[PDB]
From Swiss-Prot:
Protein name (Swiss-Prot/TrEMBL): Thermolysin
Species of the source: Geobacillus stearothermophilus (Bacillus stearothermophilus)
Keyword Metal-binding belongs to the record: yes
Inducing or repressing factors: Is expressed in the stationary phase. Up-regulated by NprA.
Enzyme Commission identifier(s): 3.4.24.27
Gene Ontology MF terms in the entry: metal ion binding; metalloendopeptidase activity
Binding sites annotated in the UniProt record for Ca(2+) 2: D138, E177, D185, E187, E190
Shown segment, full-protein numbering: 236 to 551 of 551
Lineage of source species: Bacteria, Bacillati, Bacillota, Bacilli, Bacillales
Disulfide cross-links: none
């Protein structure tokens, strides 16, 4: 809508207070005019019709329990936007400042979040497996990164291409979490997963096997579940990314870590320049190697660590 840009205040899913960019026109709306063509957050009102209604509030204060997932969806979409802009010189997911839209309160007891081709969507969870999923910064960035991938490499959502797609979303979700510096880690979804269990998460990048996911190519899932294991075989690539950044010795192969900024630059370049819709793990290795070469030179430590990391997870 047309209106006046202002700043509201509210509480997120985890009870933290934060300011949010809003728009005033009779009501205060969750519409952030300060980033690209705008960031818009909607209420799906426990239904499955999308997007639902643009979030409207009477007093620009968002402290109701019902407000919390909208606050976080709105705020963390903003943070993710800032990450891609400030760190990668990318303007929104399409690179031309496309409007970012999110709906919360999707369905009832819905233990999921997704990117539907046009917008982000967050369930409230059932209160046992998940609390509202927009409460996790890595979750929000993971979803927005699907949009980025769709508009760039266009990796199809099956088999190894699909698993790369997932890993890219896990990689950048994590890098956004570190960028915001709010209890950052190499785990996925820990902030909103299983409120009755501390210390766990949906996935681990540092040790995927912790939650049943493969950390080596030899252990890859070859069946037909999960579109050929896109959420499973992503562990192989996640582990590789972790190793590139942090270093370590994995199945006897040692890797010198080059840090997360360089990890981000190498993978962002691979994603936006060399990956294709049907790229497999081997092609990803080649793309990451070419990216690191482009950025740091053929004989660099960066290139050598990329190679070591893929070697470590058995990807040639
Ligand atoms: O497969 C899909 O498209 C939906 C799936 N969604 C999903 O797993 O929701 C929970 C969650 C999301 C990100 C990080 C941790 C937990 C996905 O985005 O991969
Ligand atoms: Ca209010
Ligand atoms: Ca964390
Ligand atoms: Ca995390
Ligand atoms: Ca938990
Ligand atoms: Zn995903």
């Amino acid at each position: 809508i047309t209106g006046t840009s202002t700043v509201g205040v509210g509480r997120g899913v985890l009870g933290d207070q934060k300011n949010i960019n809003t728009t005033y026109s009779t009501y205060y709306y969750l519409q952030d005019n300060t980033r690209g063509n705008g960031i818009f957050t909607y209420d799906a009102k426990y239904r499955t019709t999308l997007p639902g209604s643009l979030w409207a509030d009477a007093d620009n204060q968002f402290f109701a329990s019902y407000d919390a997932p909208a606050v976080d969806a709105h705020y963390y979409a903003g943070v993710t936007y800032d990450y891609y802009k400030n760190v990668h010189n990318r303007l929104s997911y399409d690179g031309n400042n496309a409007a970012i839209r999110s709906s919360v309160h999707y369905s009832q007891g819905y233990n999921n979040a997704f990117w539907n081709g046009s917008q982000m969507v967050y369930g409230d969870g059932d209160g046992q497996t998940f609390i509202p999923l927009s409460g996790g910064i890595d979750v929000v960035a993971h979803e927005l990164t699907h949009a980025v991938t769709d508009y760039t490499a266009g990796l199809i959502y099956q088999n190894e291409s699909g698993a790369i797609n997932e890993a890219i979303s896990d990689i950048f979700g994590t890098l956004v979490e570190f960028y915001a510096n709010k209890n950052p880690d190499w785990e996925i979804g820990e902030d909103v997963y299983t409120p009755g269990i501390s210390g766990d998460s949906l996935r681990s990048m540092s040790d995927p096997a912790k939650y049943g996911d493969p950390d080596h190519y030899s252990k890859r899932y070859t069946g037909t579940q999960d579109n050929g294991g896109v959420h499973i075989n992503s562990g192989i690539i996640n582990k590789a990314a972790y190793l590139i950044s942090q270093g370590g010795t994995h199945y006897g192969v040692s890797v010198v870590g080059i840090g997360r900024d360089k990890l981000g630059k190498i993978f962002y370049r691979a994603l936006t320049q060399y990956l294709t819709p049907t790229s497999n793990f081997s092609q990803l290795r080649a793309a990451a190697v070419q990216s690191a070469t482009d950025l740091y030179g053929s004989t660099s430590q960066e290139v050598a660590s990329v190679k070591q990391a893929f070697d470590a997870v058995g990807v040639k």
